[PDB]
Structure 1
Amino acid sequence: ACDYTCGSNCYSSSDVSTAQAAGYKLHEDGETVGSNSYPHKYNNYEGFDFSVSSPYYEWPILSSGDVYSGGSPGADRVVFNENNQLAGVITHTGASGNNFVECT
C-alpha cells in the first residue's frame, strides 16, 4: 500500500522500514555508507510531520529495496530515529536546492 511515492517510488511506511533498518543498523554500529556520513541527524524543519520522536535520522531509500552505499543515493530519502522508526519520506523533488520534502 505505497504511502510514500517520491515522484517515482511506491514504498509505504512498510517499505521505508526496510530502508531504515539499513540506516539504523549502520547507525547502531555508528558506521556510514558511501563517501558521505549517512545516516545522520536530520532535525526536520522544512515542515515535516514526523509522527516519530527525535532525534531524526536521514537515510536514502533505494527504489530497489536495498541498502544504499554511496554519497549520492537519490532524491528519495527516508528519515527515522534511534528507535527504529520512520520520520517519513523526503525527496529532492525540486525541494528548491539540497532541501528535502516528504514524498507523495
Structure 2
Amino acid sequence: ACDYTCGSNCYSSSDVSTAQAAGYKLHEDGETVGSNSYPHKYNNYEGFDFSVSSPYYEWPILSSGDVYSGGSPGADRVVFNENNQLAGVITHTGASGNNFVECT
C-alpha cells in the first residue's frame, strides 16, 4: 500500500524515517536550509491531534526520495519534536492558504 498518503504522493515508513532523521540532525546542529529555513518550529495552528510533546519542527519530505537540501520543498512535511519523536506527517495539498492537512 502507501504508509503515508500526502495529496497524491506516497511515502513509506523508511521514507519518513530517513527524512525525519535528516531534519532532526540539522536541528541538533542549529543548521537550516532553503528560503524558508528548514527545519523550523511548527506551532501547530491547525490544532492537530499530536500525542507527543512539543516543541515541534517541520521538515520537507520529498516525493522524489532525496533528502531536502535547500531546494524546492514541495508541499509535504514530517513533524518531529526534541526527542526526535514523529509528531505526524502533514501537507499543504488539500489545504487552503498556507495551512496544512495530515497525510493519511
- TM-score for both structures, normalised by structure 2: 0.86
d(CA) in 2 for partners of 1:77 and 1:23? 10
- Provide the secondary structure at the position in 2 that maps to 1:57: strand
Q: Is the strand fraction higher in 1 or 2?
A: 2
Contact in 2 for aligned 1:17/1:85 (Cα 8 Å): no
d(CA) in 2 for partners of 1:60 and 1:36? 10
Please identify, of 36-45 and 4-13, the stretch whose mean Cα deviation from structure 2 is larger. 4-13
Contact in 2 for aligned 1:56/1:82 (Cα 8 Å): yes
Contact in 2 for aligned 1:13/1:86 (Cα 8 Å): no
TM-aligned CA deviation for residue 57 of structure 1: 0.6
Change (3 A) 1:39 1:101: same
Change (3 A) 1:9 1:47: same
Gapped regions of structure 1 (runs ≥ 5): none
Gapped regions of structure 2 (runs ≥ 5): none
TM-aligned CA deviation for residue 68 of structure 1: 0.8
- TM-score for both structures, normalised by structure 1: 0.86
Please identify, of 48-57 and 6-15, the stretch whose mean Cα deviation from structure 2 is larger. 6-15
Residue identity (%) = 100
Please identify, of 43-52 and 32-41, the stretch whose mean Cα deviation from structure 2 is larger. 43-52
d(CA) in 2 for partners of 1:65 and 1:85? 21
TM-aligned CA deviation for residue 71 of structure 1: 5.7
Change (3 A) 1:45 1:36: closer
d(CA) in 2 for partners of 1:34 and 1:58? 13
d(CA) in 1 for partners of 2:34 and 2:69? 5
1:61-86 deviation digits (Å, cap 9, x = unpaired) = 11233221226401111111111121
d(CA) in 1 for partners of 2:66 and 2:72? 14
Contact in 2 for aligned 1:18/1:65 (Cα 8 Å): no
